Amino acid sequence: VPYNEYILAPASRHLVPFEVLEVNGSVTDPSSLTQSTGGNATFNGPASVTFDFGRNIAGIVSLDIGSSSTRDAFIGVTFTESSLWISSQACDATADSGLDSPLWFPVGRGAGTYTADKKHNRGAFRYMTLVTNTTAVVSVRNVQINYTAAPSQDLRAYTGYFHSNDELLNRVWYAGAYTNQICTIDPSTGDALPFLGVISSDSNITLPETNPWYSNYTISNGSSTLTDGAKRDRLIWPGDMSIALESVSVSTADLYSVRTALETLLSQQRSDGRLPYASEPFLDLVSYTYHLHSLIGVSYYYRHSGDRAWLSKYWGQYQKGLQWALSSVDNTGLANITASSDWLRFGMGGHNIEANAILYFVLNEAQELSQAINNHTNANWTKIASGIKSATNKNLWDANNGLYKDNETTTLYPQDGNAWAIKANLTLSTNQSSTISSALSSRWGNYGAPAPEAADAVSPFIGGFEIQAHFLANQPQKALDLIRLQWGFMLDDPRMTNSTFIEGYSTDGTLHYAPYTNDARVSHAHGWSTGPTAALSFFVAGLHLTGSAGATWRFAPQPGDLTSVDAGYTTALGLFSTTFKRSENGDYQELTFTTPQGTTGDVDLAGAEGTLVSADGERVFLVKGTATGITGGSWNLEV
Ligand SMILES: *[C@@H]1O[C@H](CO)[C@@H](O)[C@H](O)[C@H]1NC(C)=O
Ligand SMILES: *[C@@H]1O[C@H](CO)[C@@H](O)[C@H](O)[C@H]1NC(C)=O
Ligand SMILES: *[C@@H]1O[C@H](CO)[C@@H](O)[C@H](O)[C@H]1NC(C)=O
Ligand SMILES: *[C@@H]1O[C@H](CO)[C@@H](O)[C@H](O)[C@H]1NC(C)=O
Ligand SMILES: *[C@@H]1O[C@H](CO)[C@@H](O)[C@H](O)[C@H]1NC(C)=O
């Protein structure tokens, strides 16, 4: 595991507080609980000691109590991911209104270990506060956390690595990787929303009132499942997978946790063929977009797993699911959406650009799965795809604004649909894609890229899709600059975790998120904001899987302003790696790339002149940086 120094995952599953932030009251030696083999912090009466673990973590709190003056003594534990919500009186929020209660332990009953329930596992918290409710003098021998995230993983045994000359990019990579494994949970501790239906937005739980909190629900079978957010929801969401899967793939290869989540959604497919908006405990809302995002997960899993048997097991369910979505396509050749529910965007309906771009992407990915199982293509899927591309550009493209309309009925040009159009090749030219890229970077604010479809929100979900779209319009600089702007804020703003990545915020730097009135409920660990991890491995390093487990590949690095990149990730067939070092001229003075043997791929080095030489003696001369159909192995650029 190269560059393991950048890995933010814990080396142990039993963690002791790293530093002491704030001590209110009288505690004689609070920093004694900072050590692994010590501890006698004596809380003299009502007091509070805030701790900092230095990173977002998850687990079950355990207190060893040595001395208590009173038998009615209590020790409370609170948790928060952000510094904004550090309080002795309450935790963060997992409900649509109100901060969560402190975990209370009756430490006066006797000396000994006091461990929390598995239902009171906290899914994500960087700062932990211990508070005393009584006049008792209580000795705390030890406070430790049992790290519960990524249960079936070796937390730091990374299958992938990324290093460049920009340390912010290197830190964003390992942050998103760690963001994903912290929302990778034991399915027994799912649904952090126990009061869905009970507590709502207009419920105004306030001031001294705190809220009960537990997890409970076995949202999936198996040992481990990837969820949307570590602290809150803790559910399986289809749309979040189109970012987290590949980011998980290039870091830990925990495709087991992904398969766990995809099979849970597939098992809940309706009679119609409609895949669900979320996993079982959540409300039965109809989403055309998220239904296709689950079909994207079937394609994405076969691409990275290589498991043709898994594909055949779910090929019929995939085909029935596509059928349900093709039903909304009308005479215009576009799909008319009558279901509004999406990620947060408000205008989903009619001939939406995002929906039709996702359907086009799904239809073309369905053709390769057809070729995988049946060794042919579907002609019906080809015409519907061609019709979407024709009608989207005829009815929704505006050449003065350089962007697609959300529908024919509006002046709004959305971030999701325009980033998805380049991702789906719904565009007719690289220049049309380059025009969208320029027009989306036009709207960038001081804290990130805005989504006008979702009020004042800065969505890292769509931002990651926009990063891939910038690269695909062959504008690598704008993509890197969005990461440095948006994710540098997400990683280095003092109200963040410096380890995991937030679910969303707003154009004004405030960490308020549009769908929530409870800003403390926002998740600083969401896997759908881990896109830069996969994109830096795919587009900057150039390591593209174009076939199952990399059976076919494309080595096309787009380094931008970077001078040195050393990156690699692992599939079933082998390791995909590269170590290239450019110059002030922007020309590769050193390039080595590694692909598994018994595989075939193409190489685009962008005008770079030289010969690619294999370790087994093969030599291929480049034509405008072009190499076509070269066999797998480790190749060196020789000038
Ligand atoms: C402190 O809090 C615990 C748990 O909420 C409660 O049972 C106890 O009565 C409280 N004691 C005082 C002195 O407030
Ligand atoms: C969830 O925990 C609550 C206790 O807070 C209990 O009422 C319920 O039975 C639990 N559900 C499951 C599935 O364990
Ligand atoms: C078109 O998009 C706008 C903005 O997204 C939305 O408000 C409007 O309802 C949409 N129209 C239809 C017919 O869906
Ligand atoms: C994208 O579309 C253009 C025409 O609009 C086509 O020439 C090109 O081959 C397409 N690219 C891919 C990867 O399908
Ligand atoms: C954030 O993390 C980096 C390492 O990833 C570290 O160098 C830096 O000091 C940290 N900053 C804060 C404020 O914790």
Residues 6+ apart with CB under 8 A from 356: 334, 335, 388, 391, 392, 426
DSSP 249: H
Q: CB–CB of 611/619 below 8 Å?
A: yes
Contact 214 CB / ligand 2 (< 6 Å): yes
Q: CB–CB of 418/440 below 8 Å?
A: yes
* Residue nearest to ligand 2 atom 2, measured at CA: 216
How far is 388 from 251, CA to CA, in rounded Å? 35
Q: CB–CB of 527/244 below 8 Å?
A: yes
**First CA to last CA across the chain, in angstroms?**
31
Which ligand ends up closest to the CA of 88?
Answer: 1
**3-class secondary structure for 22-36?**
EEECCECCHHHHHCC
How far is 473 from 552, CA to CA, in rounded Å? 22
119 CA to middle of ligand 2, Å? 8
Q: Judging by DSSP bridges, how do beta strands 619-621 and 575-582 pair with one another?
A: unpaired
Residue 505 carries which side chain, given as an amino acid letter?
Y
Which ligand ends up closest to the CA of 342?
Answer: 3
Residue with tokens 């949202």: 219
639 CA to middle of ligand 1, Å? 75
Q: CB–CB of 94/214 below 8 Å?
A: no
Residues 6+ apart with CB under 8 A from 379: none
Residue 65, CA atoms < 13 Å, CB-side half-sphere? 28
Per the structure block, which two tokens stand in for 581?
Answer: 């070092």
Ligand 5 atom closest to the CA of 8, numbered from 1: 5
Burial status of residue 166 (CB atoms within 10 A of its CB: 0-12, 13-18, 19 or more): buried
DSSP 289: H
Ligand 2 atom closest to the CA of 194, numbered from 1: 1
Ligand 1 mutation pick, 91, 103, 134, 210, max ligand atoms within 8 A of CB: 134
Q: How far is CA 390 from CA 426, 428, 435, in A?
A: 9, 9, 18
How far is 7 from 178, CA to CA, in rounded Å? 8
How far is 226 from 138, CA to CA, in rounded Å? 40
Ligand 1 mutation pick, 48, 70, 71, 104, max ligand atoms within 8 A of CB: 104
Way the structure was solved:
X-ray
How far is 386 from 574, CA to CA, in rounded Å? 36
How far is 88 from 181, CA to CA, in rounded Å? 28
CA angle 426/430/434 to nearest 5° reads: 100
Q: CB–CB of 398/387 below 8 Å?
A: no
What backbone phi and psi angles, to 5 degrees, belong to 359? -65, -40
DSSP 452: G
338 CA to middle of ligand 3, Å? 11
Q: CB–CB of 63/143 below 8 Å?
A: yes
Ligand 3 mutation pick, 407, 408, 412, max ligand atoms within 8 A of CB: 407
DSSP 60-71: EEEEEEEEES-T
Q: CB–CB of 435/494 below 8 Å?
A: no
DSSP 155-206: TT--S-EEEES-HHHHHHHHHHHHHHHHSEE-GGGB-S-TTBTTB-SS----
Which ligand ends up closest to the CA of 411?
Answer: 3
Contact 55 CB / ligand 5 (< 6 Å): no
What's the length of the chain?
A: 639
**Sign of the C-alpha dihedral computed for residues 487, 493, 498 and 501 taken in this order:** negative
Q: Count the neighbouring beta carbons within 10 Å of the beta carbon of residue 400.
A: 5
Per the structure block, which two tokens stand in for 368?
Answer: 């390769």
Q: What is the dihedral of CA 83, 88, 89, 92, to 10 degrees?
A: 30
How far is 351 from 118, CA to CA, in rounded Å? 46
Residue with tokens 């409609």: 274
Residues 6+ apart with CB under 8 A from 53: 15, 17, 18, 125, 126, 127, 128, 145
Nearest to 175 by CA among 626, 608, 483: 483
Going from the N-terminus, what domains does the chain have, and what CATH number goes with each? 4-147 (2.60.120.260), 161-540 (1.50.10.10), 543-638 (2.60.420.10)
Give the three-class secondary structure for 132.
strand
Contact 409 CB / ligand 3 (< 6 Å): yes
494 CA to middle of ligand 5, Å? 10
Ligand 2 atom closest to the CA of 212, numbered from 1: 5
How far is 466 from 475, CA to CA, in rounded Å? 11
